[PDB]
Amino acid sequence: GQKVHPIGMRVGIIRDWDAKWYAEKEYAEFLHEDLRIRKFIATKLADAAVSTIEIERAANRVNISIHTAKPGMVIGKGGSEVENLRKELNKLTGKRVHINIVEIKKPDLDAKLVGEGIARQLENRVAFRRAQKQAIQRAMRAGAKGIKTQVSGRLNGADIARSEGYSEGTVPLHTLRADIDYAWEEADTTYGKLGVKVWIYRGEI
RNA sequence: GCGGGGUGGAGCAGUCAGGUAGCUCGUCGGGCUCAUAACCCGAAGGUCGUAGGUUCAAAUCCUGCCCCCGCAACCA
RNA sequence: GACGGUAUCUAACCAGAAAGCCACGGCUAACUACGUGCCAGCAGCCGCGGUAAUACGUAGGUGGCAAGCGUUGUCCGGAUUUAUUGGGCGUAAAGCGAGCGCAGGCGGUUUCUUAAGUCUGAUGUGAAAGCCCCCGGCUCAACCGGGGAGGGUCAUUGGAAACUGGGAGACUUGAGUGCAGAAGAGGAGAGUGGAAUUCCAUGUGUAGCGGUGAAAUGCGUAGAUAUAUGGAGGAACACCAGUGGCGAAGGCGGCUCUCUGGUCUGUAACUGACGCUGAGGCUCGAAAGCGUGGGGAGCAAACAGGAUUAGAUACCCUGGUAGUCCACGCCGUAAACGAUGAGUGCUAAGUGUUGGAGGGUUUCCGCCCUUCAGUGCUGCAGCAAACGCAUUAAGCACUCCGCCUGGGGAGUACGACCGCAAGGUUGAAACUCAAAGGAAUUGACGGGGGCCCGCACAAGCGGUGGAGCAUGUGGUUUAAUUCGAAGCAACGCGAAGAACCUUACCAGGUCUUGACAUCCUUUGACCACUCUAGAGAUAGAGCUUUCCCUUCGGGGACAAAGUGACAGGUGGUGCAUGGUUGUCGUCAGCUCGUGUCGUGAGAUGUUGGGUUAAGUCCCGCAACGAGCGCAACCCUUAUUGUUAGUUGCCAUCAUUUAGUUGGGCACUCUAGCGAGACUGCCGGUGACAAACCGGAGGAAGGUGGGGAUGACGUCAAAUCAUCAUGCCCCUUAUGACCUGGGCUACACACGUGCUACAAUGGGAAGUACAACGAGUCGCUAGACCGCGAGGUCAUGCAAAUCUCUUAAAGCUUCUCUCAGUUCGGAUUGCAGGCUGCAACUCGCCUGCAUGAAGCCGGAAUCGCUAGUAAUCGCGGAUCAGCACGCCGCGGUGAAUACGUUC
RNA sequence: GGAGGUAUGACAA
Numbered sequence A: 001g002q003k004v005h006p007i008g009m010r011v012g013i014i015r016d017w018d019a020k021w022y023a024e025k026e027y028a029e030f031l032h033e034d035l036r037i038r039k040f041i042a043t044k045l046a047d048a049a050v051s052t053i054e055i056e057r058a059a060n061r062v063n064i065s066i067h068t069a070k071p072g073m074v075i076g077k078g079g080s081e082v083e084n085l086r087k088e089l090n091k092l093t094g095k096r097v098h099i100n101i102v103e104i105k106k107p108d109l110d111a112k113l114v115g116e117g118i119a120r121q122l123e124n125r126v127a128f129r130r131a132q133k134q135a136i137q138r139a140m141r142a143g144a145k146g147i148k149t150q151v152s153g154r155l156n157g158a159d160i161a162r163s164e165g166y167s168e169g170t171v172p173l174h175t176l177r178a179d180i181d182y183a184w185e186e187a188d189t190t191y192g193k194l195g196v197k198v199w200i201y202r203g204e205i
Numbered sequence B: 001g002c003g004g005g006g007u008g009g010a011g012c013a014g015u016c017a018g019g020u021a022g023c024u025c026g027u028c029g030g031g032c033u034c035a036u037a038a039c040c041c042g043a044a045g046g047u048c049g050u051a052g053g054u055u056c057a058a059a060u061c062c063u064g065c066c067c068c069c070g071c072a073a074c075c076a
Numbered sequence C: 001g002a003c004g005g006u007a008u009c010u011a012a013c014c015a016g017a018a019a020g021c022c023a024c025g026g027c028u029a030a031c032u033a034c035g036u037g038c039c040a041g042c043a044g045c046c047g048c049g050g051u052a053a054u055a056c057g058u059a060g061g062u063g064g065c066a067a068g069c070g071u072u073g074u075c076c077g078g079a080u081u082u083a084u085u086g087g088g089c090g091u092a093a094a095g096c097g098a099g100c101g102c103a104g105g106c107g108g109u110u111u112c113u114u115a116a117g118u119c120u121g122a123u124g125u126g127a128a129a130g131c132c133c134c135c136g137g138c139u140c141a142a143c144c145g146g147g148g149a150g151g152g153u154c155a156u157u158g159g160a161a162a163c164u165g166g167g168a169g170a171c172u173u174g175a176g177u178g179c180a181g182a183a184g185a186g187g188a189g190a191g192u193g194g195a196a197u198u199c200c201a202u203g204u205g206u207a208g209c210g211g212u213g214a215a216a217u218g219c220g221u222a223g224a225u226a227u228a229u230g231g232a233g234g235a236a237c238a239c240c241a242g243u244g245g246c247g248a249a250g251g252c253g254g255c256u257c258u259c260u261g262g263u264c265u266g267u268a269a270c271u272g273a274c275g276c277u278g279a280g281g282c283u284c285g286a287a288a289g290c291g292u293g294g295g296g297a298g299c300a301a302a303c304a305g306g307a308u309u310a311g312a313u314a315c316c317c318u319g320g321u322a323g324u325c326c327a328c329g330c331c332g333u334a335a336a337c338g339a340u341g342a343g344u345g346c347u348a349a350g351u352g353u354u355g356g357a358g359g360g361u362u363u364c365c366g367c368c369c370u371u372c373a374g375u376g377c378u379g380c381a382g383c384a385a386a387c388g389c390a391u392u393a394a395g396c397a398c399u400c401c402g403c404c405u406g407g408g409g410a411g412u413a414c415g416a417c418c419g420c421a422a423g424g425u426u427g428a429a430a431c432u433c434a435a436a437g438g439a440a441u442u443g444a445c446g447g448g449g450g451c452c453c454g455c456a457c458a459a460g461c462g463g464u465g466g467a468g469c470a471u472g473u474g475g476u477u478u479a480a481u482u483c484g485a486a487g488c489a490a491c492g493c494g495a496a497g498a499a500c501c502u503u504a505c506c507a508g509g510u511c512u513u514g515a516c517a518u519c520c521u522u523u524g525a526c527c528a529c530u531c532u533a534g535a536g537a538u539a540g541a542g543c544u545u546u547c548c549c550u551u552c553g554g555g556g557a558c559a560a561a562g563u564g565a566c567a568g569g570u571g572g573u574g575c576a577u578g579g580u581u582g583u584c585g586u587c588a589g590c591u592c593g594u595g596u597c598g599u600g601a602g603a604u605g606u607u608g609g610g611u612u613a614a615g616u617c618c619c620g621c622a623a624c625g626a627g628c629g630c631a632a633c634c635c636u637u638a639u640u641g642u643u644a645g646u647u648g649c650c651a652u653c654a655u656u657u658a659g660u661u662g663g664g665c666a667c668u669c670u671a672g673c674g675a676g677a678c679u680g681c682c683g684g685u686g687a688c689a690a691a692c693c694g695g696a697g698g699a700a701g702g703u704g705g706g707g708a709u710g711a712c713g714u715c716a717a718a719u720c721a722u723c724a725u726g727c728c729c730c731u732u733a734u735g736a737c738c739u740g741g742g743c744u745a746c747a748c749a750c751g752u753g754c755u756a757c758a759a760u761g762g763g764a765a766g767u768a769c770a771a772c773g774a775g776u777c778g779c780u781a782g783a784c785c786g787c788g789a790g791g792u793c794a795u796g797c798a799a800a801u802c803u804c805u806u807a808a809a810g811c812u813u814c815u816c817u818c819a820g821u822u823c824g825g826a827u828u829g830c831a832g833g834c835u836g837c838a839a840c841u842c843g844c845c846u847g848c849a850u851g852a853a854g855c856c857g858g859a860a861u862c863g864c865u866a867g868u869a870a871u872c873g874c875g876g877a878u879c880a881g882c883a884c885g886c887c888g889c890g891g892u893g894a895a896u897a898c899g900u901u902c
Numbered sequence D: 001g002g003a004g005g006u007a008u009g010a011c012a013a
């Protein structure tokens, strides 16, 4: 049967909102501005390993914390790339945008980054078992208490879609205290979308 | 010409011996069933072939008429 | 010298004239594109082809072979698939139903002899050519030549004597006889005994009896059933009785007698291999059946009637003929079964029991030991596909016999023999299939079993099904009635808001780089607005017409036009998909690692004894651990310490109409931090455990209540219409704009709801107590007008401050008086209120008027186990307006649970 | 614990 979103289950229990601002009359406007900001960043830095976007609002200002495993690539030489990003975002939003980059130590423990890697490899027609196996190995080396991965769709162009998954360690989705990260990524192939799901259980809080 | 029959869709009662239109199957609707059958609950369907008489009253009695069925319509 | 100017040799010239066939899914070496779409077609078998075909056709490649390649035909092989080499017959095909036996096959020990078999030598022959071995010739090879070898169940002849056979003896172990014993439903014949049934006779006696799931038929007042005494006759032999006995098998059970077979144990007197098997034959052979003649109680095909059933030529009931019985004679078949031919020898044990024998005891009885022949059970070695067999082999061996060779057709057809007949014995083919089959494994299932749980049933309360209306659906209708959902798990569902928009549908009016994108574009404003026509989209005029920098060349930001790439599909496929969700179900399960077991699929763990809500825990266990689940961590609710004390609270005080004001936060309250509940403690039960029962304390006790949380998976479940997306289709149209209409239709069927049918009520008046939530052009106070819906002015509040908001049931009085009503409030007329550009299609609401069905609802069916059902309101999401739906809140507040058969 | 006797359900997927 279906399962609650692993993150949504824990938001407000041990995980916090990414959109870290408060507003009453401008709630809808700020929320949609944030969504457009997130979409724009996703398009812009697609090649960079951008995972989490934390948005804070201070009056007309907007502070944006971007976590990435390639801070140099995001920054550019002498901050050229981050500065170009700021100007484009200022045009987009209509207000001062301050950007703060964060280094994602241990990229192997980020659900979105691991899932993105598997999706990229599938697009390149790597064996799905190989992609998932090496992802699990890297995660365990990084020190995840457990990891779980799943790929669904027309695997290897088969006419009947199915789901193939692997896991290692412990991933107790029902234990609320457990710090379990999750992310869903899609790989666009010749036969259509393949869904990639990654659960990463770190040290519980 | 001799008989037998026309009563709900079908098969039948009732008719002699006037008072009250039924039985079996069927049809329609709803149930039961995963579904169908069976089963269960409701409902419809004829003014008794037809026209006249008799009667207080006719599916029932009388007369005619029309349909349907079997038989006969000629023998040395 | 026919061949013949032939072979051959020499010299000149030229890569120039000289490579196809089949195959490429697996078997099988060889792979991709199109086209195709269960069509065309391929194919030796498996099998390919249903819109993404390495299997079809073409193409490009690749593999095999090559002047050949492939197809068909036929033979051998593979085929151990006729097994001499070299198979089998318990359950896969296969042991005749059993025995008696002629011929035949085979045969115990040993002395001598013989030399038929057997072994061996010599000789003769087994032509030549051809295979094979050496050696040669053609340029090689093919081919040719020379010399050898081989090839016989060969003939003659010489040897050997182990084995088989013959001949002459000997032997006693096998076989049989004698002698002494043992048991027995062995057979045949003639008698005979008791219980019971039925019938007959006679008493008593009265209204039933009998029978089924329930009934009926039937018997009975012409006296039944019952009951008592008798009589008749038939069949079978209770207790004993026992994997007990006996028989070759079929089979044989009261008792007695007569006739009669076999078996077993001793003994070692006798014979001295006389034995085993045994085609064909012969004999015997359950039950049913057949002929002749008897007999006939009970039972009982057929048959009759009563039931059951949709039907019931059956199961059930009441009767009942043949038959069952006897004699004689046929028949000759059975799952005639241990589904296992007979004989013989050999290969651990343990333990019953039948019939014996010997011994050591024991006074006897009896106990112990040994031993033979049966008969069971358990179990090594060994065997087996496995199940299993295992001194009573399916083990190890030898002899003889019967029998099997894929399934069906078929034990059929024809023929023959036998039979009175029924039929039996013998026994094919055409044709057709790629399976049939045995054992075991995992699931699923069972009108199998055991143990359990859930508002599953039971116990209860209230409903739906009946009526009106709201609402969804089917059906029908329509220009359209947009699309999706179809048992549980579709149908107050997507839709948390269809007059317009929404809107995807229809009619009509319209447009074509397009309503919306990115890229090139240019002599830059775009818009916006006024007027005109239009239903509007739109068009036709006027109207105004751009920002940002740099050094000034321009550029960048933005329109807008031109232009082509392109856009755009709520077009299709949820049987190509991602994502999301339903569902079993919050049920306790689902699995993995290592190890071990099994030939193997698999198994174990996860099972078992307890225990739990739980695969929860404990214990035991070839299992030891682990993971996803379970539980916990989380939210809310139930008590409370403390920090805080306004916008909240008011006890202490004084004042106000007012918690008002002052004053204080004490209380409540609010919300952070904590405390608290852990079977923690006590008693009893329990395997010293888990745990279970009870107790104390406490606000709360065993998960306190509730929520969130939904394992691996299941239904090609749902969604291409949230979104995204492979492939397919449309592209001046399936795309886009506008007006109107539709989605709201209405002979009918269903689901879900609301309102009722009244007195536990209707109406009137008075009076009291909540909670969750919402609020800026929004909640709206207060006042005034209005019968009312509402309207006017106007106030506070971005809110624990103000408002929505004095909640309704409730309680107290009055009235109605059982009435289709003073119930009911549908439909309808008129008149209004709002919201909105607009209320006809088609909104909600108000007043007056009208006053529908409805008198508690068939078959059937639903929810709920406590602050629950029932009932009463209040808020909110969507939202200009519009809910009987949904989400949430509080008020009042029960009945019942014996119990798990269904 | 074991052993001999006493109503229906096209076809493919």
Ligand SMILES: [K+]
Binding pocket: C055
């Ligand atoms: K092939």
Ligand SMILES: [K+]
Binding pocket: C083
């Ligand atoms: K053989």
Ligand SMILES: [K+]
Binding pocket: none
């Ligand atoms: K036999």
Ligand SMILES: [K+]
Binding pocket: C115
């Ligand atoms: K000889």
Ligand SMILES: [K+]
Binding pocket: none
């Ligand atoms: K005897």
Ligand SMILES: [K+]
Binding pocket: none
């Ligand atoms: K007879």
Ligand SMILES: [K+]
Binding pocket: none
């Ligand atoms: K037998």
Ligand SMILES: [K+]
Binding pocket: none
């Ligand atoms: K014995």
Ligand SMILES: [K+]
Binding pocket: none
């Ligand atoms: K055949």
Ligand SMILES: [K+]
Binding pocket: C464, C857
């Ligand atoms: K009702």
Ligand SMILES: [K+]
Binding pocket: none
């Ligand atoms: K209803």
Ligand SMILES: [K+]
Binding pocket: C574, C718
């Ligand atoms: K689906």
Ligand SMILES: [K+]
Binding pocket: none
């Ligand atoms: K799906």
Ligand SMILES: [K+]
Binding pocket: none
């Ligand atoms: K294992």
Ligand SMILES: [K+]
Binding pocket: none
């Ligand atoms: K507190």
Ligand SMILES: [K+]
Binding pocket: C720
């Ligand atoms: K779509």
